[PDB]
Design a binder for this molecule. Structure first.
Ligand code: HEM
Ligand code: HEM
Ligand SMILES: CC(C)(C)OC(=O)N[C@@H](CS[C@@H](Cc1ccccc1)C(=O)NCCCc1cccnc1)Cc1ccccc1
Ligand SMILES: CC(C)(C)OC(=O)N[C@@H](CS[C@@H](Cc1ccccc1)C(=O)NCCCc1cccnc1)Cc1ccccc1
Lengths: 450, 450
């Protein structure tokens, strides 16, 4: 019963168990599962998330066909998941013409011109991050990066998307911060996908109605009271053609809070762990920042893009830690791409974590070597093997904003502080075996003032 | 032979002559021909440009279906014309997926953010226009508007699209101005459409190879030597997906020189004729400009959009003089829209001039009444009866730039000069019976200094 698909197609893979499929192999998580399957089976393999067949591909030509060439026609939507409730209008969750409509209505929001207008706002809380770090640096005590970076990442969101100016580390009782931090169920949905329609008619949603109703009623207070923020850029858009609905506008805001707060703060903790365990990379980066920005000059939009070694450090960290881990597209038609037939309903998956650490494409893939992305070596990197933001029409729409936000934080922090490991700094860093790419133990480092 | 199409469909219209069709009725031009056909036949009618059937529509619901609803699927391209040569890659001439590709690659070029960056450049030559007008104002002599406005409109193009700073009125020998002013055949093509492929294989083009080869070799001098100009915004775009080709990039530049130089200068001459023949409209506009910009303050992007009466004067002039005169779409499939069958190959036409002067939609349509577009009355205007920039996915892509350019010129001119008619001022203004909406005799007015 649906477990003989890859058997008939002649595709290798682990033998699935009834009902469960291959989900028991997730005990070490999927990044360790994708690496093992990439070795035992080769270029392609197939497993089952319960009854859902998943076809993994690693050929760069075939990846380009799925992500770019046959996107609008075949591989348009991602794996369906629920219950979402009213959040079906989210751009990352929307499907077919509904997504292509929202992707068009939100594309001008992420241009370089709008991002350059957001830099003064993002740089404002970079100084707040330094002041909070200095209070932890002048008092000798190891700092938890996920708490000090999460406070910064939240500060950027509340202003760049709603204009609410809060010091999350010093103002927790503000209704916005208290609700945006709210903010076993999912492995059950993986094995019980026939219970998603039950939770939808029961009005259960993966987001608590506490936060959504607050954000829905907080946005209408901001909309009816009213710039440079994502909210105003979406209000001006509603003034495919059919304009952004009121409910759709709030659904996109919540998606921007999830990614911006948790991706930006988690990658910064990964970067600072690599910079602390490699003092040579941190010193060379601090020398480039001081050369471009002397006398601790404030970073601007142009000065950030001028730093090449900073971009090399960010790109190398995203290679070791691609937080998305996997890229997925649902096959909607019986299509044959690159001489391989893919039936309808099969979930095509790209193991980004496994491809980023593949020794056949990277020399010493486990080492932190920023020289891979130097201007002399960046050309020999396949853009479909290294996909930290995906690829194609449905790649990360906030790639430029996320890169600009993290670099503005790293510049202002490395201008004032040098980071060194502690005795309790878990070296080497072990990744969590859950559903999010995060360190097992939180990263703790010693912050010293320059 | 192809002259019995509207006869079979039951569509009224003038009886066509063999070979010629109804082109002999163009002796008074098409705007007088569209008005007469709108009266004798009613809401729809059909005539023949030689052997080419042309179906005219005036119903606002059916116009929306052609221009917006059934654009990408049916009414996508305009009437084919030649010989164009390498200019087939022009966005206004491109067809089907080629146009939709160029429309996407050039859409971010015309955003409000890029236009706001062009205002300091456009406002620079507004002062040049005042200095040249003052030299003609201090010496009492009637000024020809088409020569003083054409000098300004050319000055805006050479800078906003290539960065070349020239005073066209004072520097005619510059290779750019001398070539951009270079810059019976077409009625023959209308009756002889089977000679277009002959001129294409003979390498004859509607543009002289003198200018095109110069512009093609002048752009490559500018490209290989290198901001804020249309050229750089297109160079950054090439750095549908498949990037702007080198030849395609030059073809779009020539199209921008045609529209920007000749539309902007011709509408300004129409506006100043209406302001001179209506001193009350000119005084009220000069009072609004002085109220927003006291002490002859320079106009900015925000201060231009703040002037409502200035927008009312511009919109009313474009009603009396829609320079495009007609909107045309080629019917590519046998489609039935709004209960009317339209065969394949028929040219659907929207008589913008006739609709703008239709007494059934406008009270006293021949009078210059800017109060029609007031904020209290602008709501009762159908956006598919008043189409000075077209409508739908293939409307005027430079609408915002053209409106901002003309208003910046009117503000800086009306800040320093008051315009009064002369004895040789042809009142009332008679339109030319040619192919371009221009006054028969050039508009001459008296310029006095404030
Ligand atoms: C280090 C930071 C980030 C990384 C590495 C990252 C990575 C990714 C990846 C891999 C995808 C899927 C691409 C694909 O399926 O081909 C994605 C999608 C997306 N990302 Fe990000 N992201 C980051 C931060 C952000 C931020 C700050 C935003 C702010 C709005 C954002 C908004 C989105 C959206 C809306 C989508 C879905 C787009 C669509 O489905 O059309 N991401 N991101
Ligand atoms: C008073 C000034 C102008 C007026 C009234 C005007 C009007 C129009 C109209 C009526 C159309 C056809 C719309 C349709 O077929 O539905 C058009 C097309 C177009 N206009 Fe303008 N125009 C003006 C100036 C400009 C300027 C300054 C540019 C600068 C680039 C420009 C670029 C274009 C282009 C590229 C197209 C064709 C777009 C396409 O085919 O996709 N126009 N214009
Ligand atoms: C672990 C498990 C697979 C059981 O579960 C999920 O991880 N489930 C997701 C569902 S679909 C998601 C789209 C998306 C998927 C994968 C990677 C990026 C994006 C979505 O809709 N938004 C995500 C927010 C935007 C973002 C995040 C990270 C990087 N770039 C952008 C995740 C999800 C769903 C709903 C709300 C938040 C997160
Ligand atoms: C009088 C007659 C019909 C025999 O002839 C033409 O009038 N022929 C045109 C051909 S198609 C044109 C697209 C277009 C058509 C009509 C109105 C606007 C645009 C084109 O391609 N570009 C035009 C330049 C952009 C522009 C102009 C005016 C207003 N807004 C934008 C005109 C033409 C062709 C080639 C080069 C220049 C002009």
């Amino acid at each position: 019963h649906s477990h003989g698909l890859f058997k008939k197609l002649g595709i290798p893979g682990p033998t699935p168990l009834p009902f469960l499929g291959n989900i028991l192999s997730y005990h070490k998580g999927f990044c360790m599962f994708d690496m093992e399957c990439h070795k035992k089976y080769g270029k392609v393999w197939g497993f089952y998330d319960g009854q859902q067949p998943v076809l993994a591909i690693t050929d760069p030509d075939m990846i380009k066909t799925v992500l770019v060439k046959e996107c609008y026609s075949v591989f348009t939507n991602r794996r369906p998941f629920g219950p979402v409730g009213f959040m079906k209008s989210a751009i990352s969750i929307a499907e077919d013409e509904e997504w292509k409509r929202l992707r068009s209505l939100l594309s001008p929001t992420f241009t370089s011109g709008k991002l350059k207008e957001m830099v003064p706002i993002i740089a404002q809380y970079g100084d707040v991050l330094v002041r909070n770090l200095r209070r932890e640096a002048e008092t000798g005590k190891p700092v938890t990066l996920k708490d000090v970076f999460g406070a910064y990442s939240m500060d950027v969101i509340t202003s760049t998307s709603f204009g609410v100016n809060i010091d999350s580390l010093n103002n927790p009782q503000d209704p916005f911060v208290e609700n945006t931090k709210k903010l076993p169920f999912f492995l059950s949905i993986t094995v019980f996908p026939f219970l998603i329609p039950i939770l939808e008619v029961l009005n259960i949603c993966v987001f608590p109605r506490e936060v959504t109703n607050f954000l829905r009623k907080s946005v209408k207070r901001m909309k009816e009271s009213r710039r440079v923020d994502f909210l105003q850029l979406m209000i001006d858009s509603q003034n495919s053609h059919k304009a952004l609905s009121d409910l759709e506008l709030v659904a996109q805001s919540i998606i921007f809070i999830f990614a911006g707060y948790e991706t930006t703060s988690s990658v910064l903790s990964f970067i600072m762990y690599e910079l602390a365990t490699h003092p040579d990379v941190q010193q060379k980066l601090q020398e480039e920042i001081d050369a471009v920005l002397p006398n601790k000059a404030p970073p601007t939009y142009d000065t950030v893009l001028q730093m090449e070694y900073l971009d090399m450090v960010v790109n190398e960290t995203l290679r070791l830690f691609p937080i998305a881990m996997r890229l997925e597209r649902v096959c909607k038609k019986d299509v044959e791409i690159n001489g391989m037939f893919i039936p309808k309903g099969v979930v095509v998956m790209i193991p980004s974590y496994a491809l980023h650490r593949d020794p056949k494409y990277w020399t010493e893939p486990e080492k932190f070597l920023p020289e891979r992305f130097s201007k002399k070596n960046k050309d020999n990197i396949d853009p479909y093997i290294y996909t930290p933001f995906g690829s194609g029409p449905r790649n990360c729409i906030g790639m430029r904003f996320a890169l600009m936000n993290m670099k503005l934080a790293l510049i202002r922090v490395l201008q004032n502080f040098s980071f060194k490991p502690c005795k309790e700094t878990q070296i080497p860093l072990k990744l969590s075996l859950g559903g999010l790419l995060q360190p097992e133990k939180p990263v703790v480092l010693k912050v010293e003032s320059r």
